[PDB]
Amino acid sequence: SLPKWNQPSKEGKKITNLFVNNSLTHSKVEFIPQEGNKIKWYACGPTVYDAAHLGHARTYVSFDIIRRILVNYFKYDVFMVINITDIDDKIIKRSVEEKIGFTELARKWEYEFWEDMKSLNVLLPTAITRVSEYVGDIVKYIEKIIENKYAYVSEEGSVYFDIDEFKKSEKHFYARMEPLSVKKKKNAYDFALWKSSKPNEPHWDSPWGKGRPGWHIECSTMASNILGDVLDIHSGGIDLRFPHHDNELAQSEAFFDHSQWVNYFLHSGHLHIEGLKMSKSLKNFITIKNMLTKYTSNQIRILFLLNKWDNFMNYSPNGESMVQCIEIDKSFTNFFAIILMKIKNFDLNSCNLYWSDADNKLNLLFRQTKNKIHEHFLDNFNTPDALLAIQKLITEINIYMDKEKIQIGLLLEIKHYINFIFDTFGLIY
Amino acid sequence: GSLPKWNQPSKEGKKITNLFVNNSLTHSKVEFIPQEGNKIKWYACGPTVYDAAHLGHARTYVSFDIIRRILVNYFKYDVFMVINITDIDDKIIKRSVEEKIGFTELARKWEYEFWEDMKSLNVLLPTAITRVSEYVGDIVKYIEKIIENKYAYVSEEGSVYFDIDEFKKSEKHFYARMEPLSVKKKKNAYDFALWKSSKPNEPHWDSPWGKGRPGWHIECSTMASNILGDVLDIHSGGIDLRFPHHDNELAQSEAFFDHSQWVNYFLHSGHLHIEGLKMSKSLKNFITIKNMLTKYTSNQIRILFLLNKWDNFMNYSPNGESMVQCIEIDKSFTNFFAIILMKIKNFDLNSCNLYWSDADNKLNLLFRQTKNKIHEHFLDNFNTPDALLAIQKLITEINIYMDKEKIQIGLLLEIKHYINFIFDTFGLIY
Ligand SMILES: Nc1ncnc2c1ncn2[C@@H]1O[C@H](COP(=O)(O)OP(=O)(O)OP(=O)(O)O)[C@@H](O)[C@H]1O
Ligand SMILES: Nc1ncnc2c1ncn2[C@@H]1O[C@H](COP(=O)(O)OP(=O)(O)OP(=O)(O)O)[C@@H](O)[C@H]1O
Ligand SMILES: Nc1ncnc2c1ncn2[C@@H]1O[C@H](COP(=O)(O)OC(=O)[C@@H](N)CS)[C@@H](O)[C@H]1O
Ligand SMILES: Nc1ncnc2c1ncn2[C@@H]1O[C@H](COP(=O)(O)OC(=O)[C@@H](N)CS)[C@@H](O)[C@H]1O
Ligand code: NA
Ligand code: NA
Ligand code: NA
Ligand code: NA
Ligand SMILES: [Zn+2]
Ligand SMILES: [Zn+2]
Structure with missing residues (x-):
């Protein structure tokens, strides 16, 4: 029956x-x-x-x-x-x-x-x-x-x-x-x-x-x-x-x-x-x-x-539901702007590339973020939580790019991963 | 022991x-x-x-x-x-x-x-x-x-x-x-x-x-x-x-x-x-x-x-001998992208017929089989020579399909995206 x-x-x-x-x-x-x-x-x-x-x-x-x-x-x-x-x-x-x-x-x-x-x-x-x-x-x-x-x-x-x-x-x-x-x-x-x-x-x-x-x-x-x-x-x-x-x-x-x-x-x-x-x-x-x-x-x-x-x-029309979408889009745009320029302008001749505790902390958070997003996609394509994980990682990369001497290769790998996820989302930056 | x-x-x-x-x-x-x-x-x-x-x-x-x-x-x-x-x-x-x-x-x-x-x-x-x-x-x-x-x-x-x-x-x-x-x-x-x-x-x-x-x-x-x-x-x-x-x-x-x-x-x-x-x-x-x-x-x-x-x-082999084949392959890839992009660009959804034909199905079968072949090559200790050859063979057939058959725009785009994905994996840029 x-x-x-x-x-x-x-x-x-x-x-x-x-x-x-x-x-x-x-x-x-x-x-x-x-x-x-x-x-x-x-x-x-x-x-x-x-x-x-x-x-x-x-x-x-x-x-x-x-x-x-x-x-x-x-x-x-x-x-x-x-x-x-x-x-x-x-x-x-x-x-x-x-x-x-x-x-x-x-x-x-x-x-x-x-x-x-x-x-x-x-x-x-x-x-x-x-x-x-x-x-x-x-x-x-x-x-x-x-x-x-x-x-x-x-x-x-x-x-x-x-x-x-x-x-x-x-x-x-x-x-x-x-x-x-x-x-x-x-x-x-x-x-x-x-x-x-x-x-x-x-x-x-x-x-x-x-x-x-x-x-x-x-x-x-x-x-x-x-x-x-x-x-x-x-x-x-x-x-x-x-x-x-x-x-x-x-x-x-x-x-x-x-x-x-x-x-x-x-x-x-x-x-x-x-x-x-x-x-x-x-x-x-x-x-x-x-x-x-x-x-x-x-x-x-x-x-x-x-x-x-x-x-x-x-x-909610008259922009109410779109306020948050605009803010998030603005934060992704500004994140990409900075990381792209830091990669482009980085000078291998004059830099120091010792792997510091700050580089290690960002890298650990990076790999942990990949695992969180993997679990979100396995959980019935949970894009809301995967988007939030990306936002949280960006908040930390922004701090790092502003303050720490930067590991060019780490920033490049992070950029490629976030681009990979944005390609999966259908976003173009 | 030893x-x-x-x-x-x-x-x-x-x-x-x-x-x-x-x-x-x-x-x-x-x-x-x-x-x-x-x-x-x-x-x-x-x-x-x-x-x-x-x-x-x-x-x-x-x-x-x-x-x-x-x-x-x-x-x-x-x-x-x-x-x-x-x-x-x-x-x-x-x-x-x-x-x-x-x-x-x-x-x-x-x-x-x-x-x-x-x-x-x-x-x-x-x-x-x-x-x-x-x-x-x-x-x-x-x-x-x-x-x-x-x-x-x-x-x-x-x-x-x-x-x-x-x-x-x-x-x-x-x-x-x-x-x-x-x-x-x-x-x-x-x-x-x-x-x-x-x-x-x-x-x-x-x-x-x-x-x-x-x-x-x-x-x-x-x-x-x-x-x-x-x-x-x-x-x-x-x-x-x-x-x-x-x-x-x-x-x-x-x-x-x-x-x-x-x-x-x-x-x-x-x-x-x-x-x-x-x-x-x-x-x-x-x-x-x-x-x-x-x-x-x-x-x-x-x-x-x-x-x-x-x-x-x-x-x-220097003086261009070993590079002759590399130049040929690169030229065929450049020309492939040139052609398929023009076919996609010139396709008109208003005037076309999109019935899924025997020719469309045969190309799709070849496409999916190529994905499985390339998969086995990569699993086989990163066998890029055989994976490159598989892409070359697929392109030869796509070129034939585009010249004569009425084309499935969506199929052509999907195949182009897969070839882009493999080329990204190879580090090639077209
Ligand atoms: N794309 C990926 N990104 C991140 N982690 C991944 C990815 N693919 C697999 N993993 C990791 O692989 C490990 C096992 O995944 P797998 O799909 O092989 O399941 P499994 O063999 O059943 O193992 P288990 O359920 O015990 O973790 C998990 O820790 C998962 O985090
Ligand atoms: N990128 C890919 N392209 C094509 N086929 C894929 C791809 N990724 C996985 N597969 C398919 O996923 C399946 C992997 O299953 P799994 O390796 O667990 O099976 P298995 O028990 O070892 O048997 P078998 O590999 O002989 O089918 C294979 O059938 C393989 O064809
Ligand atoms: N407010 C809404 N919110 C979210 N999804 C919506 C929606 N209003 C419609 N949809 C979805 O849009 C698709 C096309 O709807 P059509 O009515 O054009 O066509 C047909 O239904 C037939 N041609 C199918 S063979 C359908 O999956 C529908 O459920
Ligand atoms: N004809 C050739 N064909 C293919 N690979 C070749 C090659 N001739 C050299 N290689 C490879 O190039 C790399 C850098 O070699 P170096 O001598 O610069 O440095 C060193 O050996 C140390 N700095 C390592 S800590 C090595 O992996 C070497 O095996
Ligand atoms: Na209903
Ligand atoms: Na019954
Ligand atoms: Na011993
Ligand atoms: Na040796
Ligand atoms: Zn060494
Ligand atoms: Zn229907």
């Missing part, structure tokens, strides 16, 4: 002792690749009908940080896919208001989305999967689910997922992550894999008649096509956990007829503003472009670094 | 990568295991600063720079690295009476040029730099402790010699761990000086035994022990230093701490030969680093060294 989860076997895998908050277990569990040091990761992308806002930025920056930690810090081999939802009721409706076709609208806002991602130093994924380019694959995916007896066709030409049949199977559980969130149909909870189109909507041909993919089947199809029958990581905002992500699991399990399509399901917390999710529906949003006319990429990334990725956060 | 023992560090609580390194203490490739956590305490013997550095010096310090970058940037070990400057030596004293600019000033001049040459070759400064002239007092105290442990004696002239026979007698000590077969004021001829009584008009320093100078080997034992302590993860130098210099350091340091293993992994770079012989100031066959840099770039010189396994000897 309660879903089971299979931790992957550790034999032959890269083992870091990283723990992650897995929505499949509702707990922090050890992260173990399916294969070697490889990580196959699908992340749900945007619905491209309008500009991206600060809440979208929080989710993609947070997962960009996690990806950089996984790749640059831990040296996992990450194969990442992000989709573009360029077929959607929202796109269709917006396109009839603006009197532009659905494709030209979608391409415009996909373009702006990637521009906004680049402006925030978010890395592009390995693969970008647009629904409009995968419709034929979605149809074949739906055919096999029907052939496995987990979907049925209405008289209208729609196709619905058969929840009751899926639950009946001993090897399958419906709504693994939110069990308690559960006319032409068998049961009301059945959701559409193929929607029969009205003759005026955009549509595609299929064995069941002209229609469009249902929302959830788009992501099962695209992720399965590129990454296969086992994903190491699937991610998205917490709102997507049910029904979207639980429905993807059911569809993909039905397609492959196995019991675990995703090993680790990661959900970022929402960015709130004045207590409510930043949302286009609520008219309380700040576009990324507007945000970047007031704050820098570094400052916005520091905002997200200060908040644990899987917890919700509140944004 | 053969030295080596103790592999325990694996419990350590970073374990399955890296194997060629350990001169075992004369074999053995798994590298940190003494503590993921830390590596590493001392590398530095230059004797009386003249310009030459290409053979460059090979040793670039090779250890590559190894350090692999350990830190690739494997994420925490490396605490010390390199010394031998600025007190008989060569420096003799050179300074010829040059007449003063002994300290001459040594400092050629130390400065050594660091300039290292800077020109993109070699990273170590964590700590230990000059003998700044450590003489600590050296005197180190010698005092060895005498107090009965492993050194004082001659009537005021020199101090290490007592080999007393040292070997101890069951816990073995003399010449790495080259066992290489073995008037003295007890035995094989005794070596820890303190040399100064002759008139030479530079000298005070000591309890009279004015003198350190012996060569005690400088490195003292400086390494002072900063890094009683167990070094790695000690390194050119192969010529293995005996007598490095074996004597082990004996001195074991005598100081009265234990049996001061160094866990002793690594020796192979010599650069030219026309069949070690490039050597004595043979008049050397090329200075500066001369080399008026003809070739940092990248090309580092590629020369990446193409040769660090612990094997290599042959340098």
Whole structure:
């Protein structure tokens, strides 16, 4: 009566002792690749009908940080896919208001989305999967689910997922992550894999008649096509956990007829503003472009670094939440300025390089800081505490650079390490 | 009994990568295991600063720079690295009476040029730099402790010699761990000086035994022990230093701490030969680093060294012969970056199709396989020749993909970032 989860076997895998908050277990569990040091990761992308806002930025920056930690810090081999939802009721409706076709609208806002991602130093994924380019694959995916007896066709030409049949199977559980969130149909909870189109909507041909993919089947199809029958990581905002992500699991399990399509399901917390999710529906949003006319990429990334990725956060506007981010960015800038000049201007001809007690104390604190930050990253990508550890080290390096005769090589190694961590954070100085 | 023992560090609580390194203490490739956590305490013997550095010096310090970058940037070990400057030596004293600019000033001049040459070759400064002239007092105290442990004696002239026979007698000590077969004021001829009584008009320093100078080997034992302590993860130098210099350091340091293993992994770079012989100031066959840099770039010189396994000897053919291949490779890397950056720059997300095709999948498979190949090469005693070849092969395929196939912008960027990461690890700059 309660879903089971299979931790992957550790034999032959890269083992870091990283723990992650897995929505499949509702707990922090050890992260173990399916294969070697490889990580196959699908992340749900945007619905491209309008500009991206600060809440979208929080989710993609947070997962960009996690990806950089996984790749640059831990040296996992990450194969990442992000989709573009360029077929959607929202796109269709917006396109009839603006009197532009659905494709030209979608391409415009996909373009702006990637521009906004680049402006925030978010890395592009390995693969970008647009629904409009995968419709034929979605149809074949739906055919096999029907052939496995987990979907049925209405008289209208729609196709619905058969929840009751899926639950009946001993090897399958419906709504693994939110069990308690559960006319032409068998049961009301059945959701559409193929929607029969009205003759005026955009549509595609299929064995069941002209229609469009249902929302959830788009992501099962695209992720399965590129990454296969086992994903190491699937991610998205917490709102997507049910029904979207639980429905993807059911569809993909039905397609492959196995019991675990995703090993680790990661959900970022929402960015709130004045207590409510930043949302286009609520008219309380700040576009990324507007945000970047007031704050820098570094400052916005520091905002997200200060908040644990899987917890919700509140944004206080009119600069309130950004005061601290600006101060921290200012301290990193001034730290780098001094250390870079001291390295550049150091004169090996005239210096004394005896290793003093002050050099030894700074070095001990340096190595201890590396160990603290390692433990923070292993603790479910705890960037708030890793950022604080860096701040504390900088406070001491600043004292040292002002007062002590300086060990040029120690300062250079410290600079390289802090740069390495800032690269992992996505900060550019 | 008659053969030295080596103790592999325990694996419990350590970073374990399955890296194997060629350990001169075992004369074999053995798994590298940190003494503590993921830390590596590493001392590398530095230059004797009386003249310009030459290409053979460059090979040793670039090779250890590559190894350090692999350990830190690739494997994420925490490396605490010390390199010394031998600025007190008989060569420096003799050179300074010829040059007449003063002994300290001459040594400092050629130390400065050594660091300039290292800077020109993109070699990273170590964590700590230990000059003998700044450590003489600590050296005197180190010698005092060895005498107090009965492993050194004082001659009537005021020199101090290490007592080999007393040292070997101890069951816990073995003399010449790495080259066992290489073995008037003295007890035995094989005794070596820890303190040399100064002759008139030479530079000298005070000591309890009279004015003198350190012996060569005690400088490195003292400086390494002072900063890094009683167990070094790695000690390194050119192969010529293995005996007598490095074996004597082990004996001195074991005598100081009265234990049996001061160094866990002793690594020796192979010599650069030219026309069949070690490039050597004595043979008049050397090329200075500066001369080399008026003809070739940092990248090309580092590629020369990446193409040769660090612990094997290599042959340098001059007049550009050995550099032809290095120039070709460097040009192909420059051209690769030029092309891929233009393809990325010219890519239009509006007008493209991004379906993940068979060609995209085949390139991705090749990419991931290249990562695993390069990983096994680095684990195989830092095999940069095979890792460089893997990158070359991958680039050949990326070039084909960019010319004809519709390109996955994200895949091209990710591959460029990986190649940048490996090139950062090699010390190449594009
Ligand atoms: N940077 C990397 N690139 C590629 N693969 C990596 C990397 N780091 C680690 N790995 C993979 O991590 C795994 C390490 O696991 P571990 O060394 O504990 O296994 P093992 O039991 O010794 O077996 P084996 O090494 O033979 O798979 C290896 O499969 C190796 O392929
Ligand atoms: N990148 C790193 N930075 C800092 N410390 C590291 C790093 N990688 C490994 N370590 C250190 O390696 C030691 C062991 O880590 P490892 O992942 O090998 O776990 P383990 O073998 O299960 O050991 P244990 O749980 O007993 O520490 C720890 O002390 C950890 O601090
Ligand atoms: N206030 C907020 N705070 C933090 N994250 C937020 C957020 N508001 C939205 N997000 C996150 O932004 C991503 C794109 O949301 P879309 O609605 O554009 O698209 C879709 O949901 C489909 N195209 C997926 S296939 C999702 O992971 C969402 O949970
Ligand atoms: N042809 C050649 N090829 C490759 N490496 C070479 C080389 N010729 C020399 N080397 C290496 O260069 C380094 C500095 O040599 P020095 O003589 O300057 O100093 C000393 O020996 C002491 N100051 C050490 S405390 C050593 O590691 C040496 O083995
Ligand atoms: Na069931
Ligand atoms: Na929800
Ligand atoms: Na003995
Ligand atoms: Na020798
Ligand atoms: Zn999705
Ligand atoms: Zn030495």
